[PDB]
Short mmCIF file of N, CA and C in Angstrom, two decimals:
data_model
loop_
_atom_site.label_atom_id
_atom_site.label_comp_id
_atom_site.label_asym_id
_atom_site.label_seq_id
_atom_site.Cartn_x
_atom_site.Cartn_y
_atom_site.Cartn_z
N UNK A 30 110.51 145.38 43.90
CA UNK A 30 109.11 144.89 43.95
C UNK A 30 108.06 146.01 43.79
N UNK A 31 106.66 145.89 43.04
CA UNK A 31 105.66 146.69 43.60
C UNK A 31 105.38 147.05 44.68
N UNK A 32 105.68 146.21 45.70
CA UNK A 32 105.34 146.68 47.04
C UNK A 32 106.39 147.62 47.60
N UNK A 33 107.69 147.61 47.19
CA UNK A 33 108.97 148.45 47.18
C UNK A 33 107.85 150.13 46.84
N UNK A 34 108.02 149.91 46.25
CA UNK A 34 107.42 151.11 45.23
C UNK A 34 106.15 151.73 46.02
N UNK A 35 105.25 151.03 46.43
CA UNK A 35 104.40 151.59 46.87
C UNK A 35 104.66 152.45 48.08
N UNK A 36 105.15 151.42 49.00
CA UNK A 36 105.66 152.25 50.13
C UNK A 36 106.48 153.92 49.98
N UNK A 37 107.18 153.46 48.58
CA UNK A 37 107.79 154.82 48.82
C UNK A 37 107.40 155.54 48.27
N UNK A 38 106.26 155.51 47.44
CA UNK A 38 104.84 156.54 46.90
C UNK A 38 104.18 157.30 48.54
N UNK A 39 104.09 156.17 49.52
CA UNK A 39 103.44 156.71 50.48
C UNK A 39 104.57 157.99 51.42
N UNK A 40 105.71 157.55 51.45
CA UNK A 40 106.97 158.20 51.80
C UNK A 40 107.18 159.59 51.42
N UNK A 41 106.89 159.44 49.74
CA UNK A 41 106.88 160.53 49.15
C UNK A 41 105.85 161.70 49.46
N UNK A 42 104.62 160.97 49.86
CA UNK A 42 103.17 161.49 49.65
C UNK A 42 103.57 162.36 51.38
N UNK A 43 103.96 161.41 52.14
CA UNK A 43 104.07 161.88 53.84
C UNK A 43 105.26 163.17 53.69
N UNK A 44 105.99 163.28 52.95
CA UNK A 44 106.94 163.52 52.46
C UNK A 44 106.41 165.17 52.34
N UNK A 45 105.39 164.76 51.15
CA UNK A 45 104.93 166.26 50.64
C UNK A 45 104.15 166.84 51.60
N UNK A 46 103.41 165.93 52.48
CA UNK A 46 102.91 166.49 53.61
C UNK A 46 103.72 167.31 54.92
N UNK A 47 104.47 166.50 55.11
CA UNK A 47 105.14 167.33 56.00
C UNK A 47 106.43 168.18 55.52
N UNK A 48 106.50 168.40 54.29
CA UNK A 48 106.58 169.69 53.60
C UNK A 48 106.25 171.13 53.74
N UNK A 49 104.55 170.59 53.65
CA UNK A 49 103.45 171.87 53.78
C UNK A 49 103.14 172.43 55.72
N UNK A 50 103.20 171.08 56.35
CA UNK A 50 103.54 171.36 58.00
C UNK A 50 104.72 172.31 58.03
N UNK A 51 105.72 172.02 57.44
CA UNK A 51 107.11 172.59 57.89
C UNK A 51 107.13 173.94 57.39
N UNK A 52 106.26 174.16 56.73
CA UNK A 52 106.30 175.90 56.04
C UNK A 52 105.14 176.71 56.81
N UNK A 53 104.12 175.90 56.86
CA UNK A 53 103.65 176.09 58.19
C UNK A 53 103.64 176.97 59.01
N UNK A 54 104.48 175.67 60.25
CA UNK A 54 105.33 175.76 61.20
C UNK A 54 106.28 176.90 60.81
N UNK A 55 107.12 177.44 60.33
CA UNK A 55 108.56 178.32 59.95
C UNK A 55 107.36 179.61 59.77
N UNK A 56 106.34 179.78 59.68
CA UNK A 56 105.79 181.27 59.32
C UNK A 56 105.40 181.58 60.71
N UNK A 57 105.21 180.54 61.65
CA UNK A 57 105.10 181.73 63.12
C UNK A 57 106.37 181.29 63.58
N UNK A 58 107.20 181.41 62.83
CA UNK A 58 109.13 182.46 62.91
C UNK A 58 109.31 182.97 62.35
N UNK A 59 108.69 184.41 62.57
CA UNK A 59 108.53 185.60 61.33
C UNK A 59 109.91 186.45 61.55
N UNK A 60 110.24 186.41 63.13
CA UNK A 60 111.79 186.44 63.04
C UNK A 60 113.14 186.12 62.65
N UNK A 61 112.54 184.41 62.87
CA UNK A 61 113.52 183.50 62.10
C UNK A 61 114.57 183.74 62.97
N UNK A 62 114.14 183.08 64.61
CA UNK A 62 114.98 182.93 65.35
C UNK A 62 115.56 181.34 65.28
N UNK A 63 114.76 180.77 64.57
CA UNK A 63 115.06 178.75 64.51
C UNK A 63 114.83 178.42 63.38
N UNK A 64 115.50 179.38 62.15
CA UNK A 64 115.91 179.21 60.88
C UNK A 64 117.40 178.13 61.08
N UNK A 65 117.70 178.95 61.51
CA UNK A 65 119.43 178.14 61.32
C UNK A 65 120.04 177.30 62.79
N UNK A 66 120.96 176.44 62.67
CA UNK A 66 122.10 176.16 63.80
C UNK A 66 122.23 176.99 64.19
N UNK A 67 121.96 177.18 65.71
CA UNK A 67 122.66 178.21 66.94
C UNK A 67 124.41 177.96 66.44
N UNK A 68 124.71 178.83 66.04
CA UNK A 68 126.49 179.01 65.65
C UNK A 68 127.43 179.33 67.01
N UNK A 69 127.95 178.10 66.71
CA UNK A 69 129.10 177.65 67.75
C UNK A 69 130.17 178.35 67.89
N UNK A 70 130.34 179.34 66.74
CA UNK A 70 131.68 180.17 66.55
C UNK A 70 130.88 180.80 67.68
N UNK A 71 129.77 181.64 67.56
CA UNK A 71 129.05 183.15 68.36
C UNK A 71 129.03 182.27 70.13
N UNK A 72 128.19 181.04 69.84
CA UNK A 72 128.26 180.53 71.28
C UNK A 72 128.90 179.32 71.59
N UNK A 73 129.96 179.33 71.83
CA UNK A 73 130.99 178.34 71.65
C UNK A 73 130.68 177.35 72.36
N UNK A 74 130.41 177.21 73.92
CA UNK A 74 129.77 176.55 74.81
C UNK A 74 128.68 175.40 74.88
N UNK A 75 127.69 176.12 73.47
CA UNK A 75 126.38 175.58 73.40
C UNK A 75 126.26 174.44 73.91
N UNK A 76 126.62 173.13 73.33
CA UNK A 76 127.02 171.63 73.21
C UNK A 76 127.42 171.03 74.68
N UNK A 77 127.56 172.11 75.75
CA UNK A 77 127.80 171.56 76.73
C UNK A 77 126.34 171.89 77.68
N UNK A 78 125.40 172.64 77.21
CA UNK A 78 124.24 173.00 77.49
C UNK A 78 123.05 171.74 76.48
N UNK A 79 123.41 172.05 75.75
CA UNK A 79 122.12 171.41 74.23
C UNK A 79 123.10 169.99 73.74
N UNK A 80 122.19 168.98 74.15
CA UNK A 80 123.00 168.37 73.04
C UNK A 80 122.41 167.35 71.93
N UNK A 81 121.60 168.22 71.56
CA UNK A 81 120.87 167.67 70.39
C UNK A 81 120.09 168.74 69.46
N UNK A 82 120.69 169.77 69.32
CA UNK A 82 120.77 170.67 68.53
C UNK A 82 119.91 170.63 67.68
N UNK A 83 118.82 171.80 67.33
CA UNK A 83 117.74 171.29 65.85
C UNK A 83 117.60 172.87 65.61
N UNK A 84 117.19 173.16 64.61
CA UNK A 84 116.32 174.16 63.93
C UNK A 84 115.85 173.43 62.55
N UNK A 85 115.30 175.04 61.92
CA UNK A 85 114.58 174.80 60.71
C UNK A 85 115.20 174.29 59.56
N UNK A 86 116.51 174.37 59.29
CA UNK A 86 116.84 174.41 58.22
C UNK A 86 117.47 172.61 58.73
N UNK A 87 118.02 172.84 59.32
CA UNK A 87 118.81 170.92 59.60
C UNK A 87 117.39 170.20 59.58
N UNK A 88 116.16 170.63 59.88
CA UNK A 88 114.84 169.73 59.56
C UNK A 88 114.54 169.57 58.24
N UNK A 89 114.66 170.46 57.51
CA UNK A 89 114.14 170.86 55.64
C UNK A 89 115.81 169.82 54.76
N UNK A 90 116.56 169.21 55.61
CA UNK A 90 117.68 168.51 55.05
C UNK A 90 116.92 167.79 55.57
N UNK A 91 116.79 166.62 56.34
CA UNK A 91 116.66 165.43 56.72
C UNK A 91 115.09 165.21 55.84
N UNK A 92 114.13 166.12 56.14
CA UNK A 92 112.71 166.12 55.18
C UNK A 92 112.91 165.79 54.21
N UNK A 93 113.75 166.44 53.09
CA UNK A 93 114.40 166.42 51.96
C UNK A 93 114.91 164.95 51.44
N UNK A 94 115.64 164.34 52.33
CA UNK A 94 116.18 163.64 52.12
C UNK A 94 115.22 162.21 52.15
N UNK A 95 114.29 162.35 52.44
CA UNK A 95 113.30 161.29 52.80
C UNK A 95 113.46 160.71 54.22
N UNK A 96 113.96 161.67 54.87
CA UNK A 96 114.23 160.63 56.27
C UNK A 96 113.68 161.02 57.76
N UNK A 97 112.32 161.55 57.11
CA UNK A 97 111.38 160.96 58.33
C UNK A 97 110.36 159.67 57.88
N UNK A 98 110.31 158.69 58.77
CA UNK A 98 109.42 157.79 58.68
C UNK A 98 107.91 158.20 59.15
N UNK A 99 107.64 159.37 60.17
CA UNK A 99 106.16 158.77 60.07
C UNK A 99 106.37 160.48 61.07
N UNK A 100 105.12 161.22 60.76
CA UNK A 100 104.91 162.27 61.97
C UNK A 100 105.83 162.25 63.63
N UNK A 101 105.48 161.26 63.78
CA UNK A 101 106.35 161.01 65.64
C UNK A 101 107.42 161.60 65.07
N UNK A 102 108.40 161.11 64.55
CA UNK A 102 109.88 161.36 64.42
C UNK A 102 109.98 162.56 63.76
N UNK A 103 108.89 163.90 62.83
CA UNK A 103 109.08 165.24 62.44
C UNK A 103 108.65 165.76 63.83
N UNK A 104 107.75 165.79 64.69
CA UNK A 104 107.35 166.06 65.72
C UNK A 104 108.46 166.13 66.79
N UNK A 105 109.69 165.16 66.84
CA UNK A 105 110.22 165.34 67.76
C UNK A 105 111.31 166.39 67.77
N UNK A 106 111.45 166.47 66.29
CA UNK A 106 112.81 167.46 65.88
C UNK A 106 111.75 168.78 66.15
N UNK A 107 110.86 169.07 65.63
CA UNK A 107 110.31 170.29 66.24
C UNK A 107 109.99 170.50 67.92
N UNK A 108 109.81 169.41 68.54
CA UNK A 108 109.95 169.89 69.90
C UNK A 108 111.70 169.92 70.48
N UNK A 109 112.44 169.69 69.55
CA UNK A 109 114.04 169.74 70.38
C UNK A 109 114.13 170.98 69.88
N UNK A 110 113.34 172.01 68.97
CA UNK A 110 114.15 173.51 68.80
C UNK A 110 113.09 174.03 69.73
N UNK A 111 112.41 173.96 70.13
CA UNK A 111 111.44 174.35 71.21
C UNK A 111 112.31 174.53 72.80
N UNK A 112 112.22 172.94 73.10
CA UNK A 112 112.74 172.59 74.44
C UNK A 112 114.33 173.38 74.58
N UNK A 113 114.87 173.39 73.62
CA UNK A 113 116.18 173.28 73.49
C UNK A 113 116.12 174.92 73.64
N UNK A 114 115.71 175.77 73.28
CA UNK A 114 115.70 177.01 73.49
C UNK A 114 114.77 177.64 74.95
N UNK A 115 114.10 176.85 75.46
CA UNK A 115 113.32 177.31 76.37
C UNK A 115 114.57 176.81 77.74
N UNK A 116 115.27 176.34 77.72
CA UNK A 116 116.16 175.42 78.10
C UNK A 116 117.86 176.60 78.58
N UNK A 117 118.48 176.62 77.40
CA UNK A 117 119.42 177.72 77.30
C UNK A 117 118.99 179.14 77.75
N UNK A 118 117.96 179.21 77.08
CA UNK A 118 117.79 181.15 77.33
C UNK A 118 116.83 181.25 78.55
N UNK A 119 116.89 182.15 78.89
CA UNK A 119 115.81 182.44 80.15
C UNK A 119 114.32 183.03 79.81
N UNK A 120 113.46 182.73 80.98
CA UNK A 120 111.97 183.41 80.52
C UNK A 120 112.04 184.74 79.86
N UNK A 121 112.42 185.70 80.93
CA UNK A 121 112.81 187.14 79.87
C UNK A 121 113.48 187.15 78.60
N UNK A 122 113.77 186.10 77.92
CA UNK A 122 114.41 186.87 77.34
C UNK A 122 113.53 187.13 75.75
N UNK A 123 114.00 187.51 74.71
CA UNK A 123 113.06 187.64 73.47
C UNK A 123 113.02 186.19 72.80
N UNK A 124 114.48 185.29 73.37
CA UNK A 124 114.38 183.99 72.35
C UNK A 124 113.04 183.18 73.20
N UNK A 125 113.09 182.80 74.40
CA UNK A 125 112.69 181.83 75.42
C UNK A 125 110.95 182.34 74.51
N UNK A 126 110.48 183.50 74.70
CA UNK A 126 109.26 184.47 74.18
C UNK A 126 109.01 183.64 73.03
N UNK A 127 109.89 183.63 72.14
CA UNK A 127 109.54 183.18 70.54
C UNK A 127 109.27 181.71 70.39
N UNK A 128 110.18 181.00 71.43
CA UNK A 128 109.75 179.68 71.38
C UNK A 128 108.10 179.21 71.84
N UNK A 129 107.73 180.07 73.17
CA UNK A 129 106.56 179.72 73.70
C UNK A 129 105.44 180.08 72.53
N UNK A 130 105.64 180.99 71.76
CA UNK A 130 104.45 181.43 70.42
C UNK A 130 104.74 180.55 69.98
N UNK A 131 105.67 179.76 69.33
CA UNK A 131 106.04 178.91 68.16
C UNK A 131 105.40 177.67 68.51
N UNK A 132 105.47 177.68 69.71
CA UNK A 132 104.67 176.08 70.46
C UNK A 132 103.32 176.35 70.74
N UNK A 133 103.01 177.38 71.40
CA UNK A 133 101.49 177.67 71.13
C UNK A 133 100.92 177.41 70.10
N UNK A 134 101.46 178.48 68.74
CA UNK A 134 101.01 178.32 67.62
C UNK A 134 101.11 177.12 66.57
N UNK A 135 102.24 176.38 66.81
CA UNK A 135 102.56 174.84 65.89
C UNK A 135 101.08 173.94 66.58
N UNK A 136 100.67 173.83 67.53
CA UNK A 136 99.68 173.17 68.43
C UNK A 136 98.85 172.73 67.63
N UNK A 137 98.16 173.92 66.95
CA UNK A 137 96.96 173.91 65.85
C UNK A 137 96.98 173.15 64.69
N UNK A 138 98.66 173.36 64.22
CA UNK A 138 99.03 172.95 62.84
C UNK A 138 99.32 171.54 62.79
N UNK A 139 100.12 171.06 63.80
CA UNK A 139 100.23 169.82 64.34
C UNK A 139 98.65 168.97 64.67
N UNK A 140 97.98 168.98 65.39
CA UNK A 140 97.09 168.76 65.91
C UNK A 140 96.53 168.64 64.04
N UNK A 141 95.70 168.88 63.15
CA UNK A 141 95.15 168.80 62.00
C UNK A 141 95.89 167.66 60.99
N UNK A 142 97.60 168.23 61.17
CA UNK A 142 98.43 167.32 60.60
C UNK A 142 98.06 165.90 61.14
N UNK A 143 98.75 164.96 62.08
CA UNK A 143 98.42 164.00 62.88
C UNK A 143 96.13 163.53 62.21
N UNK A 144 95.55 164.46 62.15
CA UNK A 144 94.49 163.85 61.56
C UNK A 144 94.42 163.45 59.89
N UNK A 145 94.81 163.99 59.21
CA UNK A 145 95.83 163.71 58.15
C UNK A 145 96.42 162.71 58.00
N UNK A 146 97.45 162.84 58.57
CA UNK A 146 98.10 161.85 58.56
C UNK A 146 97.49 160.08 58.75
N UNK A 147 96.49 159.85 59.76
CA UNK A 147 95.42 159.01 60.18
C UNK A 147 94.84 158.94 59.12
N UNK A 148 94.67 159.61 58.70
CA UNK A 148 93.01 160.08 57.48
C UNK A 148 93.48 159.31 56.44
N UNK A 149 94.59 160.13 55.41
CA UNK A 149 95.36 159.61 54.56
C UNK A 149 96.07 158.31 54.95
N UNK A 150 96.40 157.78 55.86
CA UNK A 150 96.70 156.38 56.04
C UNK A 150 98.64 156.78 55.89
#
């Protein structure tokens, strides 16, 4: 149908938007501590700590793939590499540090996105 179609013009369009969020977001991780899967070989355990595992790159697959429906659901995968690290590592340490900037700083980017998102419909 046309109406098929349209929707997934808008999909696409939300699509390219939270594209430009997600690159964003990934530049205050200039470390690129929540580039990748915490690796299970290095911390074998993880899964009995975390169990819903996220970073950057398992987000840029599912983005990719068309399979966020609407801001809420990109929003939540960015707060599970947040929580999820503030969670495992301790205040001292350099990871727990990187998450609290990353959430400070996504705040701004998020916050504009979400009007956007409204704006553009």
């Amino acid at each position: 149908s046309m109406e098929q179609v349209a929707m997934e013009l808008r999909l696409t369009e939300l699509t390219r938007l939270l594209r430009s969020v997600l690159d964003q977001l990934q530049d205050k991780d200039p470390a690129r501590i929540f580039a990748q899967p915490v690796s299970l070989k290095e911390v074998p355990d993880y899964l009995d700590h975390i169990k819903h595992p996220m970073d950057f790159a398992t987000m840029r697959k599912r983005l990719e793939a068309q399979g966020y429906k609407n801001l809420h659901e990109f929003e939540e995968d960015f707060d599970l590499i947040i929580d999820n690290c503030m969670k495992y590592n301790a205040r001292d340490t350099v990871f727990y540090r990187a998450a609290v900037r990353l959430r400070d700083q996504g705040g701004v980017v998020l916050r504009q996105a979400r009007r956007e998102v409204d704006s553009i419909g």
